[PDB]
């Protein structure tokens, strides 16, 4: 329903994904036997984002985001996302994979998982 790690992090699980928790926090893989499964992942980070990160006004605060691209296969190129937002003294990081044929993916689901994510 509404996952809540012990280390303070409280996120709202995405419909249709396997809720599976990792030491740092949570990890999300898309259910079904899909050709191109999306796969998010949330953690409570301490260290700040590297200097070069771009910015987008996400929600009411700001977000520091990086976007990778690599040669894939016939499902299109690999696209890895990376974005963090101010969470008190630390940050709430979202990590999202995806292949695409039609240029950079919107990441609607990876952003909604950062806009909602708060801390205890």
């Amino acid at each position: 329903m509404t996952l809540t790690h012990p280390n303070g992090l409280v996120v709202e699980r995405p419909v249709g994904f396997d809720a599976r928790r990792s030491a740092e926090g949570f990890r999300f893989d898309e259910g079904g036997k899909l050709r191109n499964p999306r796969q998010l992942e949330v953690q409570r980070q301490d260290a700040p984002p590297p200097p070069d990160l771009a910015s987008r006004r996400l929600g009411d605060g700001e977000a520091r985001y990086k976007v990778e691209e690599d040669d894939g296969g016939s499902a299109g190129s690999e696209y890895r996302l990376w974005a963090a937002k101010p969470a008190g003294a630390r940050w709430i990081v979202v990590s999202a994979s995806e292949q695409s044929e039609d240029g950079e993916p919107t990441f609607a689901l990876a952003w909604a998982l950062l806009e909602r994510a708060r801390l205890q």
């Binding site: 899909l34 050709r35 191109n36 296969g73 016939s74 499902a75 044929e101 240029g103």
Partner: protein, 401 residues
């Protein structure tokens, strides 16, 4: 020759007759193709000064395309002479053949492609006319792409304008409409009888190739089977392996994805989409030179990105590109450290990295599965498609019988 003479009458101007009818052109393109001494004919035409006249007089791009394609691939000795004459006739940047689908091919580039292609089909064994095996009538949903349909992506109408805009706006309901049609791959396979599976396989492979250069072939275009065979021989695969990769691609492909696929590659964006039977990515075709075996170094260098995306929609070029890329992926795998690929071996434990260097006849099934994963995605990054290995394996079994 008998043929040069007939032609000479058909294209000659008399008093008060200075035009070559459309009926006359067809008889000339006909007469060329029905020729038994096509090299001698050409030389006997150049000996009269008729050979430059020929290329000058046959004007509508569709007929020039047939005449040039025909002479380019029925000549050997006299091929250079015809090419000379053609250049000479290109006075003042005429249109030539460079309209419509062939708009990204300069007229000398069209001639030079039919030449290499005709030669490639004889040398590699896919010149012979294929049975007119019949295609599906479907226009949407899984398995309605060119593989099922015989309808070239470059003949597809422009995407409705309202729709073009939604796609540019990354509208979910609209991207859904023009992308891969399948979600749960297992479900798809369940809802097919083993007999439905067999028919898709036959429909894919049985049809004449959807080729942009039909007249480069001596008679009718080869069957996809025939081309796939030649391609498996060339890269040490089997036509069953090639077929299974393509059938899995064509199942996750619609007509509307065929249209999005090509039109985005040659629009202002110059997109990096996967195009054609084997769903080859435009940038990947270039980086790995996936037409090496049909076209020479000269021709390839000149090819604009869009020419390449347009070749990718020509079944024979696509099949050859697909086969080549597969042998690539297999090769890259024979050079690998299974110990540094823990997920990969976790998922396909019978995987035999060494045997990837040889023929698929000798691969463990788990090798077809892992190669499927690493064809739809990055090759050998130790991240896998969960669905694509069972999906291609299923197509494989169908072809193995």
């Amino acid at each position: 020759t008998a043929t040069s003479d007939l032609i000479e009458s058909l294209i000659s101007y008399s008093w008060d007759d200075w035009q070559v009818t459309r009926q006359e052109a067809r008889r000339v393109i006909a007469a060329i193709r029905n020729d038994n001494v096509p090299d001698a004919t050409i030389a006997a035409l150049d000996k009269s000064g008729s050979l430059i006249k020929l290329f000058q007089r046959v004007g509508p791009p569709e007929l020039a395309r047939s005449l040039i394609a025909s002479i380019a691939g029925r000549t050997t000795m006299q091929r250079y002479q015809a090419r000379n004459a053609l250049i000479r006739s290109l006075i003042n940047n005429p249109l030539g053949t460079q309209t419509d689908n062939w708009i990204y091919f300069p007229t000398i580039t069209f001639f030079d492609i039919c030449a290499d292609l005709a030669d490639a089909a004889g040398r590699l064994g896919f010149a012979a006319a294929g049975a007119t095996g019949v295609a599906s009538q479907a226009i949407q949903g899984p398995f309605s792409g060119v593989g099922a349909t015989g309808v070239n992506p470059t003949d597809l109408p422009s995407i409705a304008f309202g729709d073009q805009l939604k796609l540019l706006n990354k509208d979910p309901a609209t991207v859904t409409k023009y992308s891969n049609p399948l979600g749960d791959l297992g479900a798809y396979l369940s809802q097919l009888s083993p007999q439905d599976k067999l028919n898709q396989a036959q429909t894919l492979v049985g049809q004449p190739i959807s080729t942009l250069f039909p007249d480069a072939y001596p008679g009718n275009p080869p069957s996809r089977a025939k081309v796939m065979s030649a391609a498996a021989r060339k890269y040490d695969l089997t036509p069953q392996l090639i077929g299974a990769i393509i059938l899995a691609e064509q199942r996750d492909q619609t007509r509307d994805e065929d249209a999005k696929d090509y039109q985005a590659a040659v629009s202002i964006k110059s997109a990096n989409t996967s195009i054609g039977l084997g769903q080859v990515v435009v940038s990947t075709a270039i980086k790995y030179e996936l037409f090496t075996d049909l076209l020479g170094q000269p021709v390839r260098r000149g090819l604009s990105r869009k020419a390449v995306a347009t070749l990718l929609a020509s079944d024979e070029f696509n099949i050859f590109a697909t086969a080549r890329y597969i042998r690539y992926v297999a090769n890259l795998a024979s050079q690998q450290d299974l110990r540094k690929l823990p997920k990969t071996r976790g998922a396909f434990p019978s995987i035999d990295l060494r045997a990837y260097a040889g023929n698929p006849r000798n691969w463990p099934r788990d090798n077809v599965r892992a190669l499927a994963s690493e064809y739809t995605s990055r090759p050998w990054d130790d991240n896998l498609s969960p669905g694509w290995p069972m999906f291609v394996d299923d197509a494989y079994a169908t072809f193995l019988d």
